[PDB]
Amino acid sequence: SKITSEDARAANPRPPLSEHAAHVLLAIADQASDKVKKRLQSLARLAKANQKDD
Amino acid sequence: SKITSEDARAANPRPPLSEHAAHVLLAIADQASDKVKKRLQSLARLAKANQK
Amino acid sequence: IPDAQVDAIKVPPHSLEAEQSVIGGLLLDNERWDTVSEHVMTQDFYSRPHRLIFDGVKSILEAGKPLDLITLSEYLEQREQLEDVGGFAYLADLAKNTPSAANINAYAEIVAERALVRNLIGVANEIADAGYDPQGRNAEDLLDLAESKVFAIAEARTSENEGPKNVDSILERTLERIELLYKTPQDGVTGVNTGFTDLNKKTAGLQGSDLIIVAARPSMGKTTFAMNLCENAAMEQDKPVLIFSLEMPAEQIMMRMLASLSRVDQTKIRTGQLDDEDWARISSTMGILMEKKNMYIDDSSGLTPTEVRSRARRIAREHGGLSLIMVDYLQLMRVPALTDNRTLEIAEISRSLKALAKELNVPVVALSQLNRSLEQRADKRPVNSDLRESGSIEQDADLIMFIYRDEVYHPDSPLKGTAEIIIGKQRNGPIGSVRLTFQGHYSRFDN
Amino acid sequence: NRKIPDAQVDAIKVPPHSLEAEQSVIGGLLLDNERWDTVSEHVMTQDFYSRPHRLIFDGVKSILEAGKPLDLITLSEYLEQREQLEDVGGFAYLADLAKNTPSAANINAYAEIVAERALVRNLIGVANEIADAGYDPQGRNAEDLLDLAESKVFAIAEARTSENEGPKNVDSILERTLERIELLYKTPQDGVTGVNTGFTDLNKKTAGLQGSDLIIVAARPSMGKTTFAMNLCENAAMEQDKPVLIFSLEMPAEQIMMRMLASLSRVDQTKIRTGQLDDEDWARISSTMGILMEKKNMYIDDSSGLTPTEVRSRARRIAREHGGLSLIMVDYLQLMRVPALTDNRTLEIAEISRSLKALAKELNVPVVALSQLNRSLEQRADKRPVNSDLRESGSIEQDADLIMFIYRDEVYHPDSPLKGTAEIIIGKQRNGPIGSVRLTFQGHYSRFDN
Amino acid sequence: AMNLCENAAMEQDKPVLIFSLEMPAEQIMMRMLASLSRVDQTKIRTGQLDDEDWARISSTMGILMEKKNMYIDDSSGLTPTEVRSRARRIAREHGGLSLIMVDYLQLMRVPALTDNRTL
Ligand SMILES: Nc1ncnc2c1ncn2[C@@H]1O[C@H](COP(=O)(O)OP(=O)(O)O)[C@@H](O)[C@H]1O
Ligand SMILES: Nc1ncnc2c1ncn2[C@@H]1O[C@H](COP(=O)(O)OP(=O)(O)O)[C@@H](O)[C@H]1O
Ligand SMILES: [Mg+2]
Ligand SMILES: [Mg+2]
């Protein structure tokens, strides 16, 4: 009831990472310095394929 | 003035300790370290009741 | 040869006298071992003979055996260490050279302090040696080594005498406090009785270690209220009441007290027009006050917090404590070191009085004036902000009480003869208001 | 026995140094003036062992800071004007310094060696000072000598704390940004990334109490400021393995514990004070105590007038025992003292605020500091507290990462329909939104509920 | 002020220097990402980024990295001398600066004038 009475915008968190994001992260990693490249590849590795709707 | 001084419920404080409290103090003393155990046993000893 | 030897101090810090007093003291009492063993270890002694003797003392007392000159000598003789310590004569000398008891704990602290400095010097030399000869260690490794060795010295002296910080210590003190409250009659009052039932219901009395600020506009009965608290403490407690009357003389405080306790018109006392009944009441009241002798009045002007503390300690020593300390007007005190800033001066006085309350475990009542800005508003009751403008005293006060009289502002008020005591701040109880009967003719507040 | 001390005096009286590295730094700057910005970050004039090199380096510093080209002639003329050229070995020695180091790009390595040697030199000097103080205490007790030793050693460590921080290029910031995101994604982020506040509505806005954050909780007297901060401490103590450290400058440890007992056990605070506890009250208090003792994750320091240095020292001591801290609470910022800034209260409070923020970053722990609202607010009494109400008491807003205000309408208006409700106003937030959270204030239990 | 910095960074070859005395460098970058990519700032904070949001952020990052014309100094309580020193250091590397942004003037300090805030 407190949530419904003081609702500052619907807080619906949807965080599954897309394969598209992993692809762009790897594309940036090609232009990044070795230190940034490792972090971008690590983030792209963390990106799981949660594709749906079809 | 008596009405104004004792209006919100009769304030008769009766704080003598119960045998129940002494029992719980001793139950805690069994799990307490030696320093705390002595203080809990001392407090339980101070608890007076002697019913039946 | 002597010039270089005089300049070079190869002897580390030590106190053979304190070491002898610890050993001699234990030979005199035995029961003090539990306290001494908390402060000193065998290795804390500088002298080799004293370490062997103390080791003997430790072994005998831990075994529950009585420690005496003969028992200790026999113990050392069995280990062929008696000759190494100086013989039976030296043991007898140790017992003879310290005829004083109750100072053994102070000597134990000195021995421990010296051992600490001795260990610190040893560590400093080790660090210096590591600095001169790093043996393959880089600067960062040497810094970590220095930090580790110094931290080890500090850790040994962390939590030596009960160490208040860890939960085990707080639990012990909590139970001790509960035990003390349960032993004393707790019919709604755990501290010094205020004499007002409604006020005691909210405050549970005037607690020990509390700094209480009583603030009011002029003629609201601020001095009157504080004095009734003093009168009640003087009549109900065996310990003395100490009053620092910075504004009024002792004779005037006594005359007002006589008017209050005897319920005789204050004007009649001043004018001398006392009837037979008035004289009988005043005389009876005086007889009781003289029988009690539990009140001190200091009317010295411009007292410093140090002077207030000094006089309070003097009186407390005579009676084993104080029932209540009343300081007439906080603003009248002075701090020679803070003459350049009145706000800081008042803040320091407030901090010092709170420290005094904790030091002597006594409630300290300090009277304060409300800021003049309140009269410009004159629409509501006094609040904490009215006192903040006069030295930020709110931060240090454990209890803040305001005195408000509607009849002063509104003579046609239906609350004629009623004074409202507002609890503006309370650490160990609720905030609110208490209505008291103000009897100006008698300089008295009634429930 | 006569040949033993001469070799020992020569080997012990010479402190660690590198004349070769010193010469290379000076020679290198004479070859490439542009390297001064990097070298000046690592070495100071006092870092040089040799007196001639200090004078020469001082000359180099003065010329380059003035934007003048540094060459052998310019430096020689500079030293000649001050009659210091003969003291350094003449023009020939300056020429020798430029000749003996024909290699560039290694000047930074030589600067680090000079700085390292200076560090060991200062350490030996401090060790001797401490040894001298130990032998001759001059009226100082053991505690004072320990504090002196800790202060001098801490000063050596502090000088080498943030030495190479100048260059801050985007590539480095991107790497640290991605590392931070990666760490957040690895940890369970069900709405809380930091220390749990225990209030869902508050966590939704703040994502918990973040590490390195300086949090200012400000309220008028009796608004429940201490109560609110303690509930944050209680929640951190019950949900984290790391300890909670409380610096209670105003209240004793016994009083804080009694209020905590009233809160966690939901027993009337007055009943605890008066001792009128029923069988049920005792059972709840006892159960709460059992849990607190099992956790042992809370420290209470009730020392008065603590300095930021003392606060930092005690915090580090406890953090070392547990590999970190869950939360640091400082009861009243204004009660702390800075002996060096006694002449100005505003500057004193500003320094305390800066020091606490530095402490939060140093230990990677949220630091909650309680503050009082300015008296001017009561004169207005028409709206909610704002950041300007705190600026009048030491400009603490600039250093705070999160500012929370406590407002109770029932205190100002007893007939308010919001009786028992306290509003928590987010006045400032670096990593989240500003706004307000309504909490249930239970004065009898000294507790805030969601 | 940051939009002015973003425009200077995208249109000039010389670097932009930012002295963020109040906010950390990570926060300034996140806000910049929200701005240049036109992605909801709350979404960036919460991590609820859709495929389109990731593509825009990634493209923006690629450009920022290609340009490398921005420096962020998040040191607190900087003196005017320190600000000048760091600015000169960076300017020497590129033959000048495009823009210098100092986040909050009031957050800077002058040890010689502690007795008077106005001065
Ligand atoms: N003779 C008297 N008859 C009636 N009321 C009196 C008499 N003398 C003093 N009072 C009252 O006693 C009070 C004295 O106030 P007091 O405590 O001395 O001042 P303050 O609040 O500044 O400390 C006032 O309310 C005054 O009206
Ligand atoms: N026995 C009690 N019953 C009800 N409320 C109480 C009791 N004791 C204290 N309180 C309330 O608890 C709060 C204590 O406020 P506190 O945090 O100590 O002050 P501050 O805001 O100055 O730090 C107040 O709102 C007070 O009314
Ligand atoms: Mg008076
Ligand atoms: Mg508090």
Chains D and E are in contact, defined as 3 or more C-beta pairs closer than 8 angstroms: yes
Helix (H) or strand (E) holding E53: helix E51-67
* Nearest by Cα to C211 from C395, C390, C403: C395
Give the 3-state secondary structure of residue E108.
coil
Residue with structure tokens 């010092």?
C352
What b/e readout covers D76-99, taking b as 16+ CB neighbours within 10 angstroms?
bebbeeeeebeebeebeebeebbe
**Helix/strand number for chain E, H first, E second:** 5, 3
Nearest ligand to the CA of C268 is 1
Chains in contact with D, where contact requires at least 3 CB pairs less than 8 Å apart: A, B, C, E
Answer yes or no: is the C-beta of D225 below 6 A from any ligand 2 atom: yes
Spatial contact of E16 and E70, defined as CB atoms under 8 Å apart = yes
**What's the Cα-to-Cα distance from C308 to each of C244, C305, C364, rounded to whole Å?**
8, 5, 11
Spatial contact of D220 and D378, defined as CB atoms under 8 Å apart = yes
**C-alpha–C-alpha distance, residues D234 and D217, integer Å:** 16
Chains A and C are in contact, defined as 3 or more C-beta pairs closer than 8 angstroms: no
Chain breaks in chain C (C to N over 2.5 A) after: none
Task: Tell me how far apart the terminal alpha carbons of chain A are, to the nearest angstrom.
Answer: 36
Spatial contact of C285 and C261, defined as CB atoms under 8 Å apart = yes
Helix (H) or strand (E) holding D164: none
Tell me how many degrees the CA angle E53-E54-E58 measures, rounded to the nearest 5. 120
Residues in contact with D150: Cβ distance below 8 Å, sequence separation at least 6, in sequence order: C150, C154, D313
**C-alpha–C-alpha distance, residues E15 and C315, integer Å:** 75
**What's the Cα-to-Cα distance from C75 to each of C57, C58, C87, C88, D104, rounded to whole Å?**
9, 11, 12, 11, 76
Residues in contact with C384: Cβ distance below 8 Å, sequence separation at least 6, in sequence order: C394, C400, C424, C425, D220, D221, D222, D378
**β-pairing, D447-449 with E70-73?**
unpaired
* Nearest by Cα to C419 from C433, C398, C400: C433
Q: Where are the alpha helices (DSSP H) in chain A?
A: 2-5, 19-29, 34-46
**C-alpha–C-alpha distance, residues B28 and B44, integer Å:** 10
What b/e readout covers C271-280, taking b as 16+ CB neighbours within 10 angstroms?
eeebeeebee
Tokens of C295: 């009140």
DSSP label of C417:
T
Tokens of D217: 């909780």
Task: Say how many C-beta atoms besides its own lie within 10 A of residue C174's C-beta.
Answer: 19
**C-alpha–C-alpha distance, residues C332 and C351, integer Å:** 15
**β-pairing, C211-216 with C399-404?**
parallel
DSSP label of D3:
S
Largest CA distance in chain C: 100
Q: Do E104 and D398 touch (CB under 8 A)?
A: yes
Strand partners, D219: D372, D406
Residues, beta carbon < 5 Å, ion ligand 4: D 226, 250, 331
Sign of CA dihedral C221, C227, C231, C237: positive
Q: Where are the alpha helices (DSSP H) in D136-219?
A: 142-159, 170-186, 200-206
**What's the Cα-to-Cα distance from E79 to each of C81, D63, E76, E88, E107, rounded to whole Å?**
69, 22, 9, 14, 9
**C-alpha–C-alpha distance, residues C416 and D439, integer Å:** 41
CA dihedral C436, C437, C441, C442 (to 10 degrees): -70
Give the 3-state secondary structure of residue D419.
coil
Nearest CA to ligand 2 atom 22: D221
**C-alpha–C-alpha distance, residues C215 and C229, integer Å:** 14
Task: Say how many C-beta atoms besides its own lie within 10 A of residue D404's C-beta.
Answer: 25
Spatial contact of D76 and D96, defined as CB atoms under 8 Å apart = no
Helix (H) or strand (E) holding D352: helix D345-363
**C-alpha–C-alpha distance, residues D127 and D289, integer Å:** 46
CA D381 to chain centre: 35
**C-alpha–C-alpha distance, residues D41 and D37, integer Å:** 7
**C-alpha–C-alpha distance, residues D317 and D323, integer Å:** 10
Task: Say how many C-beta atoms besides its own lie within 10 A of residue C50's C-beta.
Answer: 23
Nearest CA to ligand 2 atom 18: D226
**C-alpha–C-alpha distance, residues D167 and B30, integer Å:** 62
Task: Say how many C-beta atoms besides its own lie within 10 A of residue D369's C-beta.
Answer: 27
**C-alpha–C-alpha distance, residues D199 and D370, integer Å:** 19
DSSP label of D33:
G
Helix (H) or strand (E) holding D367: strand D367-372
DSSP label of D333:
G
Question: D338: phi > 0 → left, psi -120 to 50 → alpha, else beta; which?
Answer: beta
Of how many residues is chain B composed?
52
C-alpha D449 to ligand 4 mean position (Å): 19
Question: D296: phi > 0 → left, psi -120 to 50 → alpha, else beta; which?
Answer: left
**C-alpha–C-alpha distance, residues C232 and C195, integer Å:** 6
Q: Phi, psi (5° rounding) for residue C411?
A: -60, -25
Q: What is C29-78 written as a DSSP string? A: HSTTHHHHHHH--GGG-SSHHHHHHHHHHHHHHHTT----HHHHHHHHHH
Q: Solved by what technique?
A: X-ray
**β-pairing, D214-219 with D402-407?**
parallel
Spatial contact of C298 and C245, defined as CB atoms under 8 Å apart = yes
Residue type at position D11: A
Task: Say how many C-beta atoms besides its own lie within 10 A of residue D376's C-beta.
Answer: 13
**C-alpha–C-alpha distance, residues C392 and D393, integer Å:** 12
**C-alpha–C-alpha distance, residues C277 and C264, integer Å:** 9
Give the 3-state secondary structure of residue D178.
helix
**What's the Cα-to-Cα distance from A46 to each of A13, A16, D325, E30, rounded to whole Å?**
18, 10, 29, 20
Spatial contact of A21 and E54, defined as CB atoms under 8 Å apart = yes
**C-alpha–C-alpha distance, residues C179 and C207, integer Å:** 16
Answer yes or no: is the C-beta of C204 below 6 A from any ligand 2 atom: no
* Nearest by Cα to C198 from C365, C443, C439, C437: C437
* Nearest by Cα to D312 from D155, D141, D142, D134: D155
Q: Give how far E91 is from chain A: nearest CA, Å.
A: 23
**C-alpha–C-alpha distance, residues C10 and C361, integer Å:** 46
The atom number, within ligand 1, closest to the CA of C270 reads 1
Task: Say how many C-beta atoms besides its own lie within 10 A of residue E72's C-beta.
Answer: 23
Spatial contact of C192 and C424, defined as CB atoms under 8 Å apart = no
Of how many residues is chain C composed?
447
* Nearest by Cα to D221 from D198, D201, D255, D250: D250
DSSP label of C412:
T
Domains of chain D: 2-160 (1.10.860.10), 179-449 (3.40.50.300)
**C-alpha–C-alpha distance, residues D24 and D244, integer Å:** 50
Q: At what angle do helices E2-11 and E51-67 cross, to 10 degrees?
A: 60
**C-alpha–C-alpha distance, residues A44 and E54, integer Å:** 12
Rg, C-alpha atoms of chain E: 16
* Nearest by Cα to D310 from D352, D267, D365: D352
Helix (H) or strand (E) holding E95: none
Spatial contact of D49 and D19, defined as CB atoms under 8 Å apart = yes
DSSP label of E45:
H
Contacts of C446 in chain B (CB under 8 A): 1
Contacts of B21 in chain D (CB under 8 A): 279, 282
Q: Phi, psi (5° rounding) for residue C423?
A: -85, 100
**C-alpha–C-alpha distance, residues D377 and A7, integer Å:** 30
Q: What is C207-271 written as a DSSP string? A: -TT-EEEEEE-TTSSHHHHHHHHHHHHHHH-SSPEEEE-SSS-HHHHHHHHHHHHHT--HHHHHH
Sheet holding C418-426, edge to edge: C295-298, C241-244, C324-327, C364-369, C211-216, C399-404, C418-426, C432-439, C444-446
Strand partners, D34: none
Tokens of C74: 């026999």
Resolution (angstroms) stands at 2.9
Spatial contact of D284 and D261, defined as CB atoms under 8 Å apart = no
What b/e readout covers D254-270, taking b as 16+ CB neighbours within 10 angstroms?
bbbbbbbbbbbbebbbb
Residues in contact with D115: Cβ distance below 8 Å, sequence separation at least 6, in sequence order: D42, D43, D47, D160, D163
C-alpha C226 to ligand 3 mean position (Å): 9
Q: What is D199-257 written as a DSSP string? A: -HHHHHHHSSB-TT-EEEEEE-TTSSHHHHHHHHHHHHHHH-SSPEEEE-SSS-HHHHH
* Nearest by Cα to C52 from C27, C24, C25, C86: C86
Spatial contact of C432 and C440, defined as CB atoms under 8 Å apart = no
Spatial contact of D38 and D108, defined as CB atoms under 8 Å apart = yes
Interface with C, mutate which of D123, D129, D220 (most C CBs under 10 A): D123
Residue type at position D306: L
**C-alpha–C-alpha distance, residues C38 and C35, integer Å:** 5
Spatial contact of D366 and D180, defined as CB atoms under 8 Å apart = no
* Nearest by Cα to C130 from C155, C110, C150: C150
**C-alpha–C-alpha distance, residues D237 and D264, integer Å:** 12
Give the 3-state secondary structure of residue A19.
helix
Spatial contact of D359 and D314, defined as CB atoms under 8 Å apart = no
Residue with structure tokens 């403008």?
C389
Tokens of C73: 């000598």
Tokens of D4: 């033993």
**C-alpha–C-alpha distance, residues E37 and C280, integer Å:** 95
Q: Do A35 and D204 touch (CB under 8 A)?
A: no
**C-alpha–C-alpha distance, residues D412 and D423, integer Å:** 13
Strand partners, E68: none
C-alpha C440 to ligand 1 mean position (Å): 6
Q: Where are the alpha helices (DSSP H) in D240-344?
A: 253-265, 269-274, 279-295, 308-322
C-alpha C314 to ligand 3 mean position (Å): 24
Helix (H) or strand (E) holding D197: none
Spatial contact of C242 and C366, defined as CB atoms under 8 Å apart = no
